[PDB]
From a paper:
Here we report the single-particle cryo-electron microscopy structure of the native transmembrane channel-like protein 1 (TMC-1) mechanosensory transduction complex isolated from Caenorhabditis elegans.
We observed a second conformation of the TMC-1 complex by 3D classification, designated as the C conformation. In the C conformation, however, the TM10 helix is bent approximately 9° compared with that in the E conformation, and there is one additional helical turn of TM10 in the E conformation. Upon successively superimposing the TMC-1 subunits from the C and E complexes, we observed that in the E state, each half of the TMC-1 complex, composed of TMC-1, CALM-1 and TMIE subunits, is rotated by around 8° compared with the C state, by way of an axis of rotation that is located near the TMC-1 H7 and H8 helices and oriented approximately parallel to the membrane. The movement of each half of the complex—when viewed parallel to the membrane plane—thus resembles the motion of an accordion, with the cytoplasmic regions of the complex undergoing relatively larger conformational displacements compared with those on the extracellular side of the membrane. Nevertheless, these results illustrate the conformational plasticity of the TMC-1 complex and, reciprocally, the possibility that deformations of the membrane may induce conformational changes in the TMC-1 complex. Of note, the E and C conformations generate distinct membrane deformation patterns.
Residue numbers in the entry:
A (entry chain C), E (entry chain E): 18 to 201
B (entry chain A), D (entry chain B): 75 to 459, 664 to 883
C (entry chain D), F (entry chain F): 18 to 63
The structure:
């Protein structure tokens, strides 16, 4: 209707969404900040229409997530500290329930790594444990947890989990596709 | 030449199809999509005519499927409701609501199947009945003047007598005329038999399709898992659906707990203790639980027996079997949980034991109820020989059970959740003991018990839909009311549990229990159809000596006698029994083979 | 209006209209009975 | 303290148990064994009394098992024979001989089961029969004086008439007295029924145990394989059993050929060709093959029908059904292979098609033979009403079929292998065409056809062992003769094939075919027992209206009537049919689930 | 009888054989060379009674094997170019049919490697192909075969198969336990 | 010795003893009918 169809066909071909989901997400994005989002949004405007990280993290589905910053950063475009409509659609098509297990595993691994070197180092594990727990476990407890995780999840003796072993170990979890889910 | 072109076109089409399942940015995805689209557009002329037509019709089918999905999304209800429940309470509480919505869809499909082919043709035929008709069916569709006055008594209506007895809701209302009329020739008894068969077939098909979709994709890689304690409790320790502050703090505390006793248990690894008092308490609990199960059986049997009246001698005492069954079903689990608390087991094994005991109670109660109802029907038919209508009576019993179960569920929601919450809020300051932190803390959702309620109700619907054609139609309203009342109760009166465990951490556990219940409920319907004989003044099968005759009478109209006699030897006991034993043996050995293969699949990885 | 043949319809109608009014009232409201753990801890501390 | 000691003892015992399965030198293995033995000896005093007794009895059981294995190895025959055949011809030729030796062991076990409990008690009772006996059984154990003179006619003996008819080899010879005698009270009809049941149960159990042993260990890791062409054809390209020079050169040539067309086929990857002549030849071959199958059916039916005489009108024409069946079975595969050669398919797909056609021919012939025999028996019983003995007659038919099959196999070995080899050796110099290199090259072993012969013969034995108690005893001699003649023929007349392919490269293919044959053969026996009625002057069941009565008559002697009547409702068609349909549906869906799991097991590796 | 029992119990505990198999193999070993094998063989004599490689390769079960030298070398004792009774028992217990798949795979890998560095290099593959084929394939054919085998059997990009990948690829062969078998 | 009642036993006995003698003879012998491929190639070359 208001938008060109070809955009809708492209979005449905790229994402898991339908026309209703695209329209609902556009309404939510516009309601996030009406000043920085125009009404008519035909053309390359979705690539240039942008919002900051604070506005996206203000949303209820992301506000209470300890890894809200990581979720915003993983789906970020070439611009740093920013999110566009295409990034919004990536974020809410990866996180949806209809997404396959492989995509969830891959983006979860990309989220859990802060440096971004395709390797789950000790510092990343400690940072994510302290983010999830909010500094309630003792330092000795954190070290013990990381040591056990490395022992039972590292097979190459590298003291750092990678994509293969992480995917092997947490894809047989009967609670991953149930937990790693955001409804919108 | 052509082979390479076809291979390239197939590869490009496969890339386009699997485009969404790759972790690329939308710019990269759009680039690849446009590149492949241009490649296919320029390469479409290289293939032959057959390949071009195949691709064209495949594209048309894909476009039609996409349009159908776009239109179908508009009709899915309770999106915001489940979204809110998920945000406030978690992703294991909302499993019950997603299960209930799927059950609603299945029940609506069953209702449409039984309404298009049975109820509507009969109503249309009744509305246009001429003088020649309306007399062959007056004895079943018109309430007699003797009992017409007493149709509104608050006990005739409550027992589904009066006008409801002579309504399309029951089996005996339908005429046994072989054809609806001239120029149409619609066989209604055959429609009745085929619809009852089709509903069970579709129930099996839908349950198995859901099970396959959940197992082949979701939990396909989830099998063959070994140990992995800390990684499971850490990487899957946060529910991403939760968008509530208090629930998030509760989840953080739960994760800290889980990790702390994880390291505590893995540290000592020492398990030495033996107290005679604890063992005596455990055996006493296990004995009193079996005593309560026996009491349940005896109460159900007594309740069925004492309802020995068919004429209106008294109705304040006839309606006691639905009340007794509902009371047992809705009260005994609470006592089970109390005895389990006294037992003092580990929380996971305590929950598993409670679920097992509830399942055993439900199955035993259902079996004894069926046996008592069948014995009562046999005794009534023997004493009868103005012929009685045992099918309509069985339908009435099942409908009354469903209605009283709904009433008891509503009362339980009102008392356990609302009134208890109000009492704790407005009376914990000056109570004798600290109730807000004591045994009745504030109230919590019970996903497993509620799902078992849904499964038991659906089993009751499956059991009695042959005798009550409009039982799924009533179940639609019952399920909608249940969804709304459960959502409101959980939103208003319940608090998120500190940590909630799962029976097997699988979505197919409840589907498997539902499939077992479907088999358990289709066994006695098949036995009734094969063994029992219809009534001579009721229903569409009043002109036959069996229920299945209306089918076989038409099979014999097209098949010779000699070939039929040759076929009738496949039903020999000496051919069925070896086949059953062979299936049992092959299942037993294939069980060990499959368990070994599944165990070695992870080892070979 | 016989008690066993006309009164119960009147009672049922009154109950039904009251139930409809209550449901509509609780449809536009967002009651929340239990108090948060912070309030419980504050009350316990007193 | 005690927990650590128990864990250490368990670990040391586990190390000792799995010692042989590790790749260590003998010195290292001895060192580890002595170390663990000393550790256990010094640590045995740390455990409690219960653990000590458990370990002591486990050690005693292990010692007894080892002694039993040591004694059992002494009784395994044909070790050097199979060793020589393996060395000369390979490890796929010797698969037939290992299969035949296992079949011999199974048949010997069946013979012992049917000989301890049936034949021996009856013979002992007959030898001690007093004047009171020997008159109730004279009509079945003594040949009448009318036909005693004509007992040796070369046609009475060849048809198992005369003395063989009144021998323990047949059903009608056994008395129907409920007890063998006083002070013993041995129920012989019950022994007969129970032995016939036990033989089938043990056959199923042994076949399934062999299948499980071969699948859970040998081919457990062999499943879920993908591509791997060159590595399979190279690392498993040499048979390590071969110890012959010429066979080794043949194997080297075969490996070279395999690799050469491997690279040749992987190189071009181009498959474009369509000749109408080739397609016409293929469809003509497929039509003539079905024509030959129909000719086989018609010939079998005609042969059974024309043997309509029961009295000794003529015997040179009555013995034509075993000859016809044997001729078809032993000749049609050759024509199948000739037609396949004309078809010009790939060798592997040609072999698969030939095996499938042979299996279809065998199954169809067996089914039509059973139907014709059953129809003939029904017609004979109807025309009878000095009562005839249809069980003894069926036993005679099966025994004659087995004997003629042995004769035809011996003749085929003598002609195809010996005489053809001699003709090629002594006549290829001056023949019209080069036969030594032409179509009849020199002769080769056919593992699949011979294994199918063994399976078909065992199916014939299973079918007719209820009517002929001493049919497995005869099959023992038949199988020993077959083993010796096949070994001699392959050693003396056959040459190693240039390259021999396998049907599925599995050892459980033939076991699965054998299990299917066992089911196919136990179906008619169960039908006979459940449906047909015994003879009133034959066998141990002459006092009952059914075969199974002798069982139920004793079940009713201990079980009440009311509970029996309640149980008799489990055999309703309306309970069996939904159960059968549920098993069918669960098998169908579990098939897709298992195939997906097996496919993804390799992917997850 | 002639021999002490304790030796027989040790041999049964270590190998797959029974007393009859031990006696038969001892008779065959003595018949291989009666001069170098004493009649009474009690004590540590099995470790010191030794035969050369030529005598063992002269046996029919090993004479036609292209890898007879490798089979003799893998099971060889500390002494180079020698085989003792314990080596005989190791060789004929590994090769037997009752041996598990793992032992066959491991000793086959040890046989197929000539240098003995736990790695299946290109030179080992070429040597074993030319030994199995007897120099009938062309050089280009051998290079193509090795290239395809490396491509379809190497996953780490090392251009040299190791224990793990070899075991993964040839243990699913339905003809390995049937071929890798020596009856004696 | 009737042809149909006594001759066939004599024929069977003669055949059985001849078969036993043949089997015993071929028991201590190692016949091998086909010639090796080398001999076939030599004959073809001539
Ligand atoms: C507020 C909006 C009101 C919209 C009115 C809709 C009218 C009700 C239609 C039936 C409602 C069925 C229902 O409750 O939804 C369940 C059901 C699916 O359940 P879930 O699997 O749990 O959800 C999908 C997540 N993977 O939803 C649907 O399928 C939508 C059906 C709408 C009509 C579709 C028309 C085609 C139906 C024939 C399909 C045959 C399949 C066999
Ligand atoms: C020359 C030596 C002569 C020895 C005379 C032995 C007398 C014959 C005894 C029966 C022969 C049975 C036979 O043919 O052997 C087959 C059979 C095994 O067949 P395969 O699995 O193919 O071989 C094992 C390779 N894994 O061999 C045996 O089992 C030996 C049986 C000897 C007697 C054992 C006594 C115990 C029998 C009861 C076992 C019950 C199991 C059920
Ligand atoms: C046969 C028996 C028939 C009885 C029918 C009773 C139907 C009542 C159930 C319907 C219902 O509960 O509606 C839901 C309603 C509020 O639900 P909710 O969507 O959460 O509120 C929206 C706020 N924005 O929930 C409510 O308003 C409160 C529910 C009151 C309980 C009704 C029964 C009392 C007796
Ligand atoms: C009912 C019909 C009963 C007929 C019984 C016939 C029994 C003959 C089969 C027995 C047999 O073939 O014995 C094997 C014998 C040689 O076998 P082999 O072990 O290889 O020789 C050892 C050499 N060291 O093989 C032979 O000696 C040659 C076989 C001759 C064929 C006998 C039948 C001819 C008719
Ligand atoms: C298709 C799915 C939804 C199942 C619906 C039930 C089917 C099996 C039932 C419902 C109505 C039935 C038909 C009703 C009337 C007729 C006309 C007459 O010639 C007898 C058979 C026939 C043709 C019946 C065949 C079976 C039938 C088609
Ligand atoms: C054990 C395996 C080998 C099966 C053998 C067949 C079994 C089932 C058969 C063979 C002989 C049978 C017994 C024969 C005679 C008696 C004595 C009398 O009281 C009736 C039952 C009883 C006791 C039978 C029970 C069943 C029986 C033991
Ligand atoms: C573990 C389950 C315990 C459930 C206890 C329910 C208590 C219900 C009390 C109802 C009180 C209603 C009157 C309130 C008076 C202020
Ligand atoms: C009463 C037992 C019900 C069994 C449910 C079977 C579920 C089938 C799916 C498998 C889920 C794994 C847990 C079991
Ligand atoms: C492919 C199977 C072909 C089988 C051909 C068998 C030929 C048998 C010929 C028998 C000749 C016997 C007389 C020999 C005269 C020297
Ligand atoms: C006539 C078909 C027979 C099927 C045999 C089933 C064998 C079961 C073991 C599986 C072996 C794999 C090849 C199939
Ligand atoms: C209607 O029923 C009455 C019952 O007495 C009957 O007499 C009448 O014939 C029926 N209708 C017709 C066909 O007139
Ligand atoms: C033996 O059989 C004869 C048949 O006439 C019978 O008369 C006799 O009584 C039987 N034996 C006895 C019991 O003497
Ligand atoms: C009546 C006493 C309880 C009987 C049922 C116990 C079921 C336990 C199920 C445990 C499954 C792991
Ligand atoms: C009668 C024509 C042949 C019919 C049987 C063909 C069986 C082919 C089996 C192929 C299995 C892969
Ligand atoms: Ca890192
Ligand atoms: Ca190397």
């Amino acid at each position: 209707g208001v938008f060109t169809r070809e955009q809708l066909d492209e979005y449905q071909d790229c994402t898991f969404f339908t026309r209703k989901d695209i329209i609902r997400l556009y309404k939510r994005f516009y309601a996030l900040n009406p000043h920085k989002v125009p009404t008519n949004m035909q053309g390359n405007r979705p690539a240039i229409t942008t919002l900051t990280f604070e506005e996206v993290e203000k949303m209820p589905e992301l506000k209470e997530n300890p890894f809200k910053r990581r979720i915003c950063e993983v789906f970020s475009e070439d611009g740093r500290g920013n999110l566009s409509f295409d990034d919004f659609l990536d974020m809410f098509s990866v996180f949806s329930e209809m997404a396959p297990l492989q995509l969830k595993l891959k983006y979860a691994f990309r989220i859990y790594d802060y440096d971004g070197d395709e390797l789950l180092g000790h510092d990343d594990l400690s940072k994510m444990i302290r983010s999830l727990t909010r500094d309630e476990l003792s330092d000795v407890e954190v070290e013990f947890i990381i040591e056990r995780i490395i022992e039972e999840a590292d097979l190459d003796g590298d003291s750092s989990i990678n994509f293969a072993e992480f995917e092997h170990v947490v894809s047989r979890s009967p609670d991953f596709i149930r937990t790693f889910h955001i409804r919108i | 030449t052509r082979q390479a072109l076809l291979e390239r076109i197939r590869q490009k089409k496969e890339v386009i199809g699997k485009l969404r399942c790759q972790a690329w940015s939308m710019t990269r995805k759009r680039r690849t999509l446009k590149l492949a689209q241009k490649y296919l557009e320029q390469h479409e002329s290289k293939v032959s005519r057959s390949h071009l037509y195949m691709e064209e019709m495949r594209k048309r089918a894909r476009l039609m499927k996409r349009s159908f999905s776009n239109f179908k999304t508009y009709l899915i209800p309770w999106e915001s409701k489940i979204k809110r429940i998920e945000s406030h309470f978690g992703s294991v509480v909302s499993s019950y609501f997603t299960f209930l919505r799927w059950i609603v869809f299945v029940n609506i499909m069953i209702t449409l199947i039984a309404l298009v082919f049975v109820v509507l043709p009969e109503t249309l035929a009744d509305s246009v009945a001429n003088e020649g008709r309306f007399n062959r069916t007056k004895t079943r569709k018109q309430i007699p003047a003797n009992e017409r006055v007493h149709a509104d008594e608050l006990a005739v209506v409550w027992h589904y007598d009066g006008y409801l007895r002579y309504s399309p809701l029951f089996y005996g209302y339908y005429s046994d005329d072989p054809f609806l009329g001239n120029k149409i020739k619609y066989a209604l008894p055959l429609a009745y038999f085929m619809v009852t068969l089709t509903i069970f077939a579709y129930s099996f098909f839908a349950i198995l399709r859901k099970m396959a979709a959940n197992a082949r994709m979701s939990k396909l890689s989830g099998s063959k898992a070994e140990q992995y304690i800390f990684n499971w409790k850490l990487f899957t320790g946060w529910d991403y659906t939760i968008g509530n502050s208090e629930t998030a703090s509760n989840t953080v505390m739960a994760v800290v707990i889980k990790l702390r006793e994880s390291i505590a248990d893995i540290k000592k690894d020492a398990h030495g203790k033996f107290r005679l008092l604890q063992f005596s308490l455990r055996v006493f609990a296990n004995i009193i639980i079996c005593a309560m199960l026996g009491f349940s059986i005896y109460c159900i049997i007594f309740a069925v027996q004492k309802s020995q009246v068919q004429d209106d001698g008294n109705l304040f005492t006839k309606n006691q079997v639905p009340s007794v069954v509902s009371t047992i079903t809705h009260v005994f689990p609470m006592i089970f949980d109390l005895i389990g608390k006294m037992e003092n087991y580990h929380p996971r094994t305590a929950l598993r034991a409670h679920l097992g005991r509830v399942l055993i109670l439900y199955t035993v109660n259902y079996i004894t109820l069926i046996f008592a109802l069948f014995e009562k029907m046999t005794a009534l038919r023997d004493r009868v020989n103005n012929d009685i209508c045992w099918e309509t009576i069985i339908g009435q019993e099942i409908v009354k059970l469903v209605t009283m179960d709904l009433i008891f569920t509503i009362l339980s929601i009102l008392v356990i959740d609302l009134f208890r919450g109000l009492w704790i809020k407005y009376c914990s300051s000056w109570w004798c003991w600290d109730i807000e932190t004591t045994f009745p803390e504030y109230g919590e959702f019970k996903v497993a018990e509620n799902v078992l309620h849904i499964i038991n109700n659906q089993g009751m619907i499956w059991l009695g839909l042959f005798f009550a054609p409009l039982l799924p139609a009533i179940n639609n309203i019952k399920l909608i009311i249940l969804m709304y009342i459960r959502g409101w109760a959980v939103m208003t009166c319940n608090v998120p549990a500190r940590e909630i465990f799962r029976a097997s951490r699988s979505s197919n556990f409840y589907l498997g229990i539902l499939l077992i219940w479907l088999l358990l409920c289709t066994l006695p319907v098949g036995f009734v159809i094969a063994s029992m004989s219809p009534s001579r003044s009721c229903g569409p099968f009043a002109r036959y000596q069996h229920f299945y005759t209306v089918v076989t009478r038409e099979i014999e109209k097209r098949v010779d006698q000699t070939v039929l006699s040759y076929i009738r030897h496949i039903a020999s006991p000496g051919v069925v029994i070896p086949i059953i034993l062979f299936l049992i043996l092959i299942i037993y050995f294939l069980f060990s083979l499959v368990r070994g293969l599944r165990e070695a699949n992870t080892d070979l990885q | 209006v016989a008690p066993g043949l006309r009164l119960w319809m009147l009672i049922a109608l009154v109950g039904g209209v009251l139930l409809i009014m209550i449901v509509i009232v609780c449809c536009f409201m967002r009651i929340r009975i239990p108090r948060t753990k912070r309030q419980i801890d504050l009350i316990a501390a007193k």
